[PDB]
Amino acid sequence: IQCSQRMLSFSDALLSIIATVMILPVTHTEISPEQQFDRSVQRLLATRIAVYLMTFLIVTVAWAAHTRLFQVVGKTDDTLALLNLACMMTITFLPYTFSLMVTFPDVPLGIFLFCVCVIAIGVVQALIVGYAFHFPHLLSPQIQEPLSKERVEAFSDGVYAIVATLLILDICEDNVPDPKDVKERFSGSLVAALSATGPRFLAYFGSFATVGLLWFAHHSLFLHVRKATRAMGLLNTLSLAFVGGLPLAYQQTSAFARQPRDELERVRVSCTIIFLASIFQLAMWTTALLHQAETLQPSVWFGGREHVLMFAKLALYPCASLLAFASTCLLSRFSVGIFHLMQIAVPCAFLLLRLLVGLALATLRVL
Amino acid sequence: IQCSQRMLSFSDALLSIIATVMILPVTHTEISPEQQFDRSVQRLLATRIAVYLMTFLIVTVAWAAHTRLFQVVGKTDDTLALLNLACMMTITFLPYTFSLMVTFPDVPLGIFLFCVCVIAIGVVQALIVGYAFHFPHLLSPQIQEPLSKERVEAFSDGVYAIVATLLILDICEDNVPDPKDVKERFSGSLVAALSATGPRFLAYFGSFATVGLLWFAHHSLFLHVRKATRAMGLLNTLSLAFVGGLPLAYQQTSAFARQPRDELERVRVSCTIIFLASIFQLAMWTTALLHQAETLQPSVWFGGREHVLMFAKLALYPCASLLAFASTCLLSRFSVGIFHLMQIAVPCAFLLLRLLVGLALATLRVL
Ligand SMILES: [K+]
Ligand SMILES: [K+]
Ligand SMILES: [K+]
Ligand SMILES: [K+]
């Protein structure tokens, strides 16, 4: 009999990769220069994004079914670890089969293969449960609504890291200048060939900063959480799903726009994505406050030395994204600039959030 | 003051992604049909593999410098977490700058940019240390040779998961049949279009199984480890570096070979890669046995109820890979088959290793 901690961490990493696989085709799409193509190149993008959102959800469901199974199987052995490897293998085929089923709706083979994948997942999990129940010492003591927060944090960590490094992976794979291109199109100066790739570096910088600071807010929240509810789990799943789309937003807001209207639309889309990624993070906190005596540590209750700080940490991005979006409709002429300032101001406000919250709590104390 | 566990886990995930970035260009290379191209298409591959091996090492060094810093900083805060995000950002640029420096050796800009990346890493770490020493309560109690095994396990887990799902990611991105191709080249049958992609699925199956079982051996070892030494860390780093090349081996041993000699050479290469990935795993155990009273739990000492099982679990792959390689030179005609049998036999031998070890310990007990 052995501890199951590391095996479940490995499973979480695999499940994060599998839930985020379908973001790569979305982010590998190109911006068409010919406007005649726009329509088509829009349609495809949408069809990809939808396939991502569904896929990330389906895998997440599997992840949940996993998390819950090994709350019934508290301890592992060699056979259980190997069968869990088998279950991970089966889960790894869900995205491909789902994409196949949606790409060929009329062909019956895709539905058949997706159903076979799901059935195989079920069979492997049944085998695990039967093995554990034939060796009762592998079952949890309570076996011999709640959701394990360790699994939640590991899954979220993996998703955040993938989304943060997505664009640097592409930069390393594709945008390393060729001596040939440097000798033909840039007159021999590698500085020029690298300057012609600056927009992609800007996109990666912005995306990494925003994703990492959203992870910072998530980490601050779950440091103060006692028990994670399935409601909080669904809210986190939605938040991560929308986090996945930040690299695309920053890749479009950094590429060239033929007309200013396009840049304004891009800013609006990016602000909407950030707001969606952050409002569900705030909703986790608000829902947890419904039953604070069980879900939160005493410090972050109504009347604690971390309640207001926590509220600020979770309400910063929603407010700033909403303000930028509003600027796109009220101060349009100064809107694109405001967004850029956000990218600098929001980090600083995190490095001084203690100070800013104290100042705001004193101002209203003298007003 | 807050616990630093999750922040370090997030850092480990990021560092694993960054250390494995350069395996993608190796695995995205194609097999040339024209033999005249072979030479060139060989050279490029080598130049890629080298760049991988160096890169994985450099990042690993950074990882080590990280692991060690936050053994001096036992507890974290908001500022420290944000500065750690900055340090991760800086580490994330090392592969690109190193590839740039090796691609343009004569241009001085690449050396300059790589040095700037390293210098920035150093500056951020100095800032972290100064912050911790100006707030002594953030320093470890011993501050107010050994290597943290938690970090080692997290890093290894991430690398293993990435290498295991590498090929399924490509299958999802590229090898989903197009209705167009199905209507033009496969006569409308999606079953045929999918059968024309079977080799890639076979490669993924084999690679995932082998990587996961190597992870199983690693997990079994480190369940029985007390303190991890830097010698063991270097051995693990070498093992993971060679693990990274398993997808390429399985992608070449499953593609078409013009002549049988090519298939034999491919089998030899794959066996060599597996042997390298596994012999350093066994070397970790052998080195730990040098000082068993400190590095290992009492069960796996010389004279325990897990010593022989552990030896078998770590010596299975080296022996089987060596045996297959030998078959390539003694039973050449039956060599390619033997390798395939290995892919089935080695998993089964893990599901029955208790039984097999008992039988072998009784046989020699009556001989
Ligand atoms: K973990
Ligand atoms: K990826
Ligand atoms: K971890
Ligand atoms: K990748």
From Swiss-Prot, chains A, B:
<dbReference type="GO" id="GO:0005765">
    <property type="term" value="C:lysosomal membrane"/>
</dbReference>
<feature type="transmembrane region" description="Helical; Name=TM4-1">
    <location>
        <begin position="110"/>
        <end position="131"/>
    </location>
</feature>
<feature type="region of interest" description="Short helix H2-1">
    <location>
        <begin position="36"/>
        <end position="42"/>
    </location>
</feature>
<keyword id="KW-0907">Parkinson disease</keyword>
<feature type="transmembrane region" description="Helical; Name=TM1-1">
    <location>
        <begin position="5"/>
        <end position="27"/>
    </location>
</feature>
<feature type="topological domain" description="Lumenal">
    <location>
        <begin position="332"/>
        <end position="333"/>
    </location>
</feature>
<dbReference type="GO" id="GO:0035751">
    <property type="term" value="P:regulation of lysosomal lumen pH"/>
</dbReference>
<keyword id="KW-0375">Hydrogen ion transport</keyword>
<feature type="site" description="Hydrophobic filter residue 3-2">
    <location>
        <position position="169"/>
    </location>
</feature>
<keyword id="KW-0633">Potassium transport</keyword>
<dbReference type="GO" id="GO:0070050">
    <property type="term" value="P:neuron cellular homeostasis"/>
</dbReference>
<protein>
    <recommendedName>
        <fullName>Endosomal/lysosomal proton channel TMEM175</fullName>
    </recommendedName>
</protein>
<keyword id="KW-0908">Parkinsonism</keyword>
<feature type="site" description="Hydrophobic filter residue 3-1">
    <location>
        <position position="24"/>
    </location>
</feature>
<feature type="topological domain" description="Lumenal">
    <location>
        <begin position="252"/>
        <end position="266"/>
    </location>
</feature>
<dbReference type="GO" id="GO:0050544">
    <property type="term" value="F:arachidonate binding"/>
</dbReference>
<keyword id="KW-1133">Transmembrane helix</keyword>
<feature type="topological domain" description="Lumenal">
    <location>
        <begin position="174"/>
        <end position="200"/>
    </location>
</feature>
<feature type="region of interest" description="Short helix H1-1">
    <location>
        <begin position="29"/>
        <end position="34"/>
    </location>
</feature>
<keyword id="KW-0523">Neurodegeneration</keyword>
<feature type="transmembrane region" description="Helical; Name=TM3-2">
    <location>
        <begin position="230"/>
        <end position="251"/>
    </location>
</feature>
<feature type="region of interest" description="Short helix H2-2">
    <location>
        <begin position="189"/>
        <end position="195"/>
    </location>
</feature>
<feature type="transmembrane region" description="Helical; Name=TM6-2">
    <location>
        <begin position="334"/>
        <end position="360"/>
    </location>
</feature>
<dbReference type="GO" id="GO:0005768">
    <property type="term" value="C:endosome"/>
</dbReference>
<feature type="transmembrane region" description="Helical; Name=TM4-2">
    <location>
        <begin position="267"/>
        <end position="287"/>
    </location>
</feature>
<dbReference type="GO" id="GO:1902600">
    <property type="term" value="P:proton transmembrane transport"/>
</dbReference>
<dbReference type="GO" id="GO:0010008">
    <property type="term" value="C:endosome membrane"/>
</dbReference>
<feature type="topological domain" description="Lumenal">
    <location>
        <begin position="100"/>
        <end position="109"/>
    </location>
</feature>
<dbReference type="GO" id="GO:0015252">
    <property type="term" value="F:proton channel activity"/>
</dbReference>
<keyword id="KW-0597">Phosphoprotein</keyword>
<dbReference type="GO" id="GO:0071805">
    <property type="term" value="P:potassium ion transmembrane transport"/>
</dbReference>
<feature type="transmembrane region" description="Helical; Name=TM2-1">
    <location>
        <begin position="49"/>
        <end position="71"/>
    </location>
</feature>
<feature type="topological domain" description="Cytoplasmic">
    <location>
        <begin position="288"/>
        <end position="307"/>
    </location>
</feature>
<keyword id="KW-0406">Ion transport</keyword>
<keyword id="KW-0631">Potassium channel</keyword>
<keyword id="KW-0630">Potassium</keyword>
<keyword id="KW-0813">Transport</keyword>
<feature type="topological domain" description="Cytoplasmic">
    <location>
        <begin position="72"/>
        <end position="77"/>
    </location>
</feature>
<feature type="site" description="Hydrophobic filter residue 2-2">
    <location>
        <position position="166"/>
    </location>
</feature>
<dbReference type="GO" id="GO:0005267">
    <property type="term" value="F:potassium channel activity"/>
</dbReference>
<dbReference type="GO" id="GO:0090385">
    <property type="term" value="P:phagosome-lysosome fusion"/>
</dbReference>
<feature type="short sequence motif" description="RxxxFSD motif 1">
    <location>
        <begin position="6"/>
        <end position="12"/>
    </location>
</feature>
